[PDB]
């Protein structure tokens, strides 16, 4: 047997098909079993319409055996394209072996696995091309467009392997494929899924700034398009046409890395924001608010 | 030497260039020598115009040695994108080693080889991403659009390796590349080519139904758009707006799998067709006709 | 560690980021250190605007250490998409190991490496799909469109690895990536870069012909669209509507191989040009001029 053929068959029982059907629509994706009690991690755009229209959409999970078991949504995060599902009273579950994305390096051979029983189901192969790469993603329905700090691969991520696992050569999940291929790192997926199981939601830091990307010889970074009122930004003293160069301890190259940098901050703690303002380098102090006050 | 470099050089003498020229046009493709007497398998869209306009198109085969030998068409199958060519009185032919596509699995390393002396000739590498995947194909000229049950690969199939072999790591032909890459399985190619050598044509089962794809919670499958008159379908009792869910022993997920499912049936034998009709599951009995009565 | 992970890390210190910034623009690319004295080979379209607008563009080189050192342009060749840069007084430089592209074969595993600290920086993997393939390229600004005789790979060449090295499994540079991926062969890069360091420019042979591609049964090749006046062509006796089939010792399949064939000729020596003219095969004699008389 081949190297990739063995690594793929080992995790095929850990990858499931997720279907959401109505009287007029049908959406399919891939999921990963990450817990023996029935917790299934997928991405948020696979199930989005079922969450925003729960009255008319029905989500079921289909296993490698062909078994079709109904599924309930535990929680979703459009800002990370992540979602946790629950099947109830299913035994002998082959749980995926979750790895550590901080141990992943450029050149490492990977497998992007989709659910074997899926319609357009695909299993592609490649290497890790980039680490900690901010990539822009579109929101499925009323869902927000977001940016994740991602693992890039030259293996193809498509509709047939999206939501499935990015797998190393030890058959461990290092990422969640999201549809020049990108995946959500597993260390991010473990942190987000842990909160979606416990609280049914996750809270992220907000500043109240909109940014456009700028790159020249004077100052390259994120240019402030609007400062919301009463926001942590306008209280800390950020004005419009400011060029952010570092949020906290992370430098900001464009508007996409700015979105990721805000979302690694701590809610309530003061954070330094360095900006270039009409040729003057100005460091400012802002305390990030929570995006969900009542769930915080 | 490398792994893929060795497997490729081993079959380079089995892959040939196929050119079809006129006073104003020129078409090129790749072929595979599958018989020592001079039988060359390619796909039908490489030679289509030469078959429909035989008066003005000339087909020649170019070997790895640079030798240009005239070629005659034995037979073609637009429904499988397959064609058999004949070069006459050529010696010391390196015949390709034909394999078994039922032994192929997901993750297996493959090589999509084009003719080495071709203009845009390409040799790509990848893995098998899906097996028994129905894929839609367009007909070259007056040729019919069709659907094959295919081997999917993340290796690129393009104009430079189309008609050439999909090759395993034992340097055996497992498929015929047809231009997210797809190939015709070799077990299908052996059955079709055997009939094109003997009879110069192959006969496929027809039912007389046109289908559109439908997917909802009531019934997902192939929805009947039209039932031809005097067809096996309307005699067996299929009506319009019916949703086919299984043809014979094969379930039908969409209109594309319906095309493949009809074409695996037996001509003249009664076959069960299960349909969902206004909420009622109805199994029906149809006897498939031959598409070519005089060649049957 | 993995095979590709080891080969990549070995050359990461030899690949640098090249940025060109103005008051309103910023361009980034990848470069390769090929000399211990500070000579950096990239492609010409990365730096083009900085060369045509040197008054307003500033080019700097960023190393794997994060070190930013100013860079000066030694010379460029739009006809090969090649450029040589110079950093001054930089020590402990990890110079890339340059290989031999004539020893490269189809199926050989390759790595297309971009600068690790680049914004859209990518490292992709693939094989060599074709050798000595003429590929058309577009000129960046006032730069001329050209055709190179290239190494084709199924590894992706994009904005993040363009200008970086194509690397074999011995971690040797076999090509310069230029953005179905193509690279400039290293033997061509050694010849062009040697002349750009010494003379600051390279001289190529010119004939004065414009060609369009033609392919039929009478004569396939490059059809002469215009013959410039006083050119080597019209003196040697080439007329319009002529179909070139061989330039020197190289046959010509289309207009793209004609561009490459002229550029391998010797300046000043008589060369045979075979053409098909109204059904008559006519061999003609032309002496190629230099494109830069004062630098010749």
| Residue B1 burial (C-beta neighbours within 10 Å; 0-12, 13-18, 19+) | exposed
Q: Does B129 touch chain A (CB under 8 A)?
A: yes
Tokens of B284: 């029906």
CA distance C156 to A117: 30
Contacts of residue C59, defined as CB under 8 A and 6 or more positions apart, other chains included, come to C18, C19, C20, C47, C50, C70, C71, C72, C73, C85
Strands C15-21 and A205-206: unpaired
**Tally: H helices and E strands in chain B:** 5, 21
B108 HSE (CA, 13 A, CB side): 23
CA distance A202 to A75: 9
Helix (H), strand (E) at residue B19? strand B15-21
CA distance A214 to A255: 8
Phi then psi for residue B247, to 5 deg, are -110, 115
Q: List, as one string, the DSSP characters of C22-67.
A: -SS-EEEEEEEE--TTSEEEE-HHHHHHHHHSTTT-EEEEE-TT--
Shortest CA distance to A169 belongs to which of A11, A54, A1? A11
Enumerate the residues of chain A whose CB falls inside 8 A of the CB of residue C160.
130
Tokens of C78: 């739009």
C162 HSE (CA, 13 A, CB side): 22
CA distance A134 to A197: 26
Enumerate the residues of chain B whose CB falls inside 8 A of the CB of residue C154.
122, 124-126, 155-156
Q: List, as one string, the DSSP characters of chain A.
A: --HHHHHHHHHTTTEEEEEEE-SS-EEEEEEEE--TTSEEEE-HHHHHHHHHSTTT-EEEEE-TT--EEE-EEEEEETTTTEEEEE--S--S-----B--GGG--TT-EEEEE--TT-TT--EEEEEEEEEEEEEEE--SSSPPPEEEEEEEESSPP-TTTTTSEEE-TTS-EEEEEE--EEEEEHHHHHHHHHHHHHTSS---EE--EEEEEE-SSS--EEEEEEE-TTSHHHHHT--TT-EEEEETTEE--SHHHHHHHHTTSPSSS-EEEEEEETTEEEEEEE-PEES-STT-
Phi then psi for residue C237, to 5 deg, are 105, 25
What distance in Å separates residue B113's CA from the closest CA in chain A?
Answer: 19
Cα angle A167, A172, A175; round to 5: 50
Shortest CA distance to C43 belongs to which of C22, C63, C28, C21? C28
Sign of dihedral through CA atoms B120, B126, B130, B132? positive
Phi-psi region for residue B163, left (φ > 0), alpha (ψ -120 to 50) or beta? Answer: left
Helix (H), strand (E) at residue C197? helix C186-198
The DSSP letter of residue B98 is B
The DSSP letter of residue C225 is E
Cβ A116 vs Cβ A64: under 8 Å: yes
CA distance C45 to A26: 46
Q: Report helix, strand or coil for C131.
A: strand
Q: Where are the beta strands (DSSP E) in C63-172?
A: 68-70, 72-77, 82-86, 109-113, 123-137, 146-153, 165-167
A107 to C6: CB separation less than 8 angstroms, yes or no: yes
Q: Does C21 touch chain A (CB under 8 A)?
A: yes
Residues paired with residue B28 on neighbouring β-strands, in sequence order: B19
CA distance C272 to C264: 13
Shortest CA distance to B217 belongs to which of A278, A77, A24? A24
Phi then psi for residue C48, to 5 deg, are -55, -55
Compare all CA atoms of chain A with the CA of C113 and give the residue at the minimum distance.
A129
B129 to A122: CB separation less than 8 angstroms, yes or no: yes
CB pairs under 8 A between A and B: 67
Contacts of residue B286, defined as CB under 8 A and 6 or more positions apart, other chains included, come to B207, B232, B233, B235, B236, B238, B270, B271, B273
What distance in Å separates residue B214's CA from the closest CA in chain C?
Answer: 36
Cβ C83 vs Cβ C43: under 8 Å: yes
Enumerate the residues of chain C whose CB falls inside 8 A of the CB of residue B58.
217
Contacts of residue C206, defined as CB under 8 A and 6 or more positions apart, other chains included, come to C231, C232, C262, C288, C289, C290, C291
What distance in Å separates residue B6's CA from the closest CA in chain C?
Answer: 8
Tokens of C272: 């045979």
Helix (H), strand (E) at residue B209? strand B209-214
Strands A250-251 and A243-247: antiparallel
C130 to B111: CB separation less than 8 angstroms, yes or no: no
Cα angle C166, C171, C177; round to 5: 10
Among the partner-chain residues C2, C24, C58, the one whose CB lies closest to the CB of A109 is C2
> Which A residues 227-256 touch C at CB under 8 Å?
253-254
Q: Does A24 touch chain B (CB under 8 A)?
A: yes
Among the partner-chain residues A126, A169, A216, the one whose CB lies closest to the CB of C25 is A216
Q: List, as one string, the DSSP characters of C98-123.
A: B--GGG--TT-EEEEE--TT-TT--E
The DSSP letter of residue B102 is G
Shortest CA distance to A25 belongs to which of B280, B88, B214, B142? B214
**Tally: H helices and E strands in chain C:** 5, 21
Cα angle B195, B201, B207; round to 5: 100
Q: How many CB atoms lie within 10 A of CB B187?
A: 17
A108 to C4: CB separation less than 8 angstroms, yes or no: yes
Shortest CA distance to A209 belongs to which of A258, A170, A167? A258
Q: Report helix, strand or coil for C263.
A: coil
Give, in order, the Cα–Cα distances in Å from C269 to each of A273, C283, C284: 67, 16, 14
Contacts of residue C211, defined as CB under 8 A and 6 or more positions apart, other chains included, come to C222, C223, C224, C225, C244, C255, C258, C259
The DSSP letter of residue B254 is S
Enumerate the residues of chain A whose CB falls inside 8 A of the CB of residue C8.
106-107
**What ranges do the domains of chain A cover?**
3-87, 101-199, 205-290
Cβ B41 vs Cβ B193: under 8 Å: yes
Rounded (10°) CA dihedral A192, A194, A200, A202: -30
Give, in order, the Cα–Cα distances in Å from A79 to each of A54, A201, B134, B250: 20, 12, 35, 41
Chains near B with 3+ CB pairs less than 8 A apart are: A, C
Enumerate the residues of chain C whose CB falls inside 8 A of the CB of residue A215.
21, 25-26
CA distance C173 to C100: 8
Domain A101-199 has CATH 2.40.50.140: no
C81 is catalytic: yes
Which fold does the domain B3-87 belong to in CATH? Thrombin, subunit H (2.40.10)
Cβ B238 vs Cβ B208: under 8 Å: no
Sign of dihedral through CA atoms C238, C241, C243, C247? positive
Cα angle B27, B86, B134; round to 5: 65
Phi then psi for residue C161, to 5 deg, are -125, 5
CA distance C216 to B55: 15
Would you please indicate which residues of B are annotated as catalytic (active-site) residues? 45, 81, 162
What distance in Å separates residue A20's CA from the closest CA in chain C?
Answer: 35
B125 to C127: CB separation less than 8 angstroms, yes or no: yes
Give, in order, the Cα–Cα distances in Å from A13 to each of A33, A94, A193, C148: 9, 6, 20, 49
Residue the block writes with tokens 């999909």: B166
Q: Does C220 touch chain B (CB under 8 A)?
A: yes
The DSSP letter of residue B212 is E
CA distance B60 to B28: 10
Phi-psi region for residue B196, left (φ > 0), alpha (ψ -120 to 50) or beta? Answer: alpha
Tokens of C95: 């110079």
Cβ B155 vs Cβ C180: under 8 Å: no
Compare all CA atoms of chain C with the CA of A220 and give the residue at the minimum distance.
C26
Q: Report helix, strand or coil for C277.
A: strand
CA distance A286 to A271: 5
CA distance A37 to C79: 63
Superfamily of domain C205-290: PDZ domain (2.30.42.10)
A2 to B253: CB separation less than 8 angstroms, yes or no: no
Answer yes or no: same fold for A3-87 and A101-199.
Answer: yes
CA distance C16 to C164: 8
Shortest CA distance to C107 belongs to which of C86, C133, C127, C135? C127
Sign of dihedral through CA atoms C96, C97, C99, C104? negative
């Amino acid at each position: 047997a081949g190297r990739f053929t063995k690594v793929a068959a080992a995790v095929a029982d850990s990858v499931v098909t997720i279907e959401s059907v109505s009287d007029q629509e049908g959406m399919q994706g891939s999921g990963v079993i990450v817990d023996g009690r029935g917790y299934i991690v997928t991405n948020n755009h696979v199930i989005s319409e079922a969450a925003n229209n729960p009255s008319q959409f029905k989500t079921t999970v289909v296993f490698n055996d062909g078994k079709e078991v109904p599924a309930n949504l535990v929680g979703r995060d459009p800002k990370t394209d992540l979602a946790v599902l629950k099947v109830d009273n299913v035994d002998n579950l082959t749980v995926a072996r979750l790895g550590d994305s901080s141990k992943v390096r450029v050149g490492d051979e990977v497998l992007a696995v989709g659910a074997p029983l899926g319609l357009r189901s695909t299993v592609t192969q490649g290497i890790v091309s980039a680490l900690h790469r901010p990539v822009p993603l579109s929101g499925e329905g009323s869902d927000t467009d977001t940016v994740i700090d991602a693992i890039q691969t030259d293996a193809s991520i498509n509709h047939g392997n999206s939501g499935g696992p990015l797998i190393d050569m030890d058959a461990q999940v290092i990422g969640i494929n999201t549809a020049l291929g990108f995946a959500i790192p597993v260390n991010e997926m473990k942190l987000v899924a842990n909160s979606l199981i416990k609280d049914g939601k996750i809270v992220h830091p907000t500043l109240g700034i909109s940014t456009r990307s700028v790159s020249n010889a004077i100052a390259s970074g994120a240019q402030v398009a609007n400062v919301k009122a009463g926001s942590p930004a306008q209280k800390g003293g950020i004005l419009e046409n400011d060029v952010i160069v570092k949020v906290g301890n992370r430098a900001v190259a464009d508007s996409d890395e700015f979105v990721v940098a805000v979302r690694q901050l701590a809610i309530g703690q003061d954070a330094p924001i360095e900006v270039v303002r009409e040729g003057r380098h100005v460091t400012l102090t802002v305390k990030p608010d929570p995006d969900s006050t009542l769930e915080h």
